[PDB]
């Protein structure tokens, strides 16, 4: 495995439902690679939120920020990385979505008020899954 995920920081958390996701990603690349990394963020209520390409992959330990666009109960976000279109790591988080204030939570409206939803990504409980792939 040439590339390894070393850590993820969920920077803006808690945030509003409509706020973008700002992640700090730390990874290590042991050797020179021919192709691109693609980092992807997926919403699971389902829809791909955003992605970012890194190419050529800088060797060594690298730290970067990934700003993913927002989407449109408890839900899940998946942060994955692929090399040359082959997925080798995935990090899943559970997300608690609740209303701003006491009365909205107890008496929620029929037509949901997106602007009053605060999401809280449970960043201490990531599910990390690795897959072995061909590299170069």
């Amino acid at each position, epitope marked *: 495995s040439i590339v390894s995920l070393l850590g993820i920081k969920v920077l803006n*958390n808690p*945030a*509003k439902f409509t706020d973008p996701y700002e992640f700090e990603i730390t990874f290590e690349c042991l050797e020179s690679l021919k192709h691109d990394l693609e980092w992807k963020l997926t919403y699971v209520g389902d829809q791909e939120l955003d992605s*970012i390409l890194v190419g050529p992959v800088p060797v060594g330990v*690298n730290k970067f920020v990934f700003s993913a666009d927002p989407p449109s109960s408890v839900t899940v976000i998946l942060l994955s990385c692929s090399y040359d279109g082959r997925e080798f790591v995935r990090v899943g988080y559970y997300v608690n979505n609740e209303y701003d204030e006491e009365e909205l939570r107890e008496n929620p409206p029929a037509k949901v008020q997106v602007d009053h939803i605060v999401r809280n990504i449970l960043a201490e409980k990531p599910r990390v899954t690795r897959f072995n792939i061909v590299w170069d």
Partner: antibody
Amino acid sequence: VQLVESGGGLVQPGGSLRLSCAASGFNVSYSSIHWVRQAPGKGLEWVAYIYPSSGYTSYADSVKGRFTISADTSKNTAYLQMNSLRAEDTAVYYCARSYSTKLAMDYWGQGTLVTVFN
Amino acid sequence: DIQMTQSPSSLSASVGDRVTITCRASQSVSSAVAWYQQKPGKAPKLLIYSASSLYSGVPSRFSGSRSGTDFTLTISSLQPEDFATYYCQQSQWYPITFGQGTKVEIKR
């Protein structure tokens, strides 16, 4: 939306100084607060940022280990604690806000001067 | 480690001219690039973010574009208030870095 800085002025090498950044018109919890400095006649230099929501920070190589950024959400205010000051830290220090701009700074304070004199 | 190499350091132009400022990322950057305007003794002001998104209230004659690792700021038709210093910025990689800046001065 205002960012008001305070705490600048004169200080000696090795001494310390605390800058404040009071925010009005928005909740700092939903943004990141940044410090940018500009030495006299020089270009902009990014210093540090903090996400008050998570407490996560980042420091420029020139100040890491010497400056510490922090925030108090209940007061809607951010701080830059500057220790082990050197002459080259003399500069105008700006406070700035980033919100939904991929860490671009959309609002800036007017700046406060920090002068390190022997 | 990443550098944002901004060029030219200065350029002379006239009212109405189309000017171009370039800023080269030393390694790949997706979109987290911004452009700022600073006038003497004043706080900088955000013009472009996300490489090409015009910030609210900024005149449309400022536009940002990209070609590979080259990030460009274009001022179509300079106005007298546009003569100033301009800075690029990247905020994808640690650490956030500004370019060295470009003076846009008046030709006479």
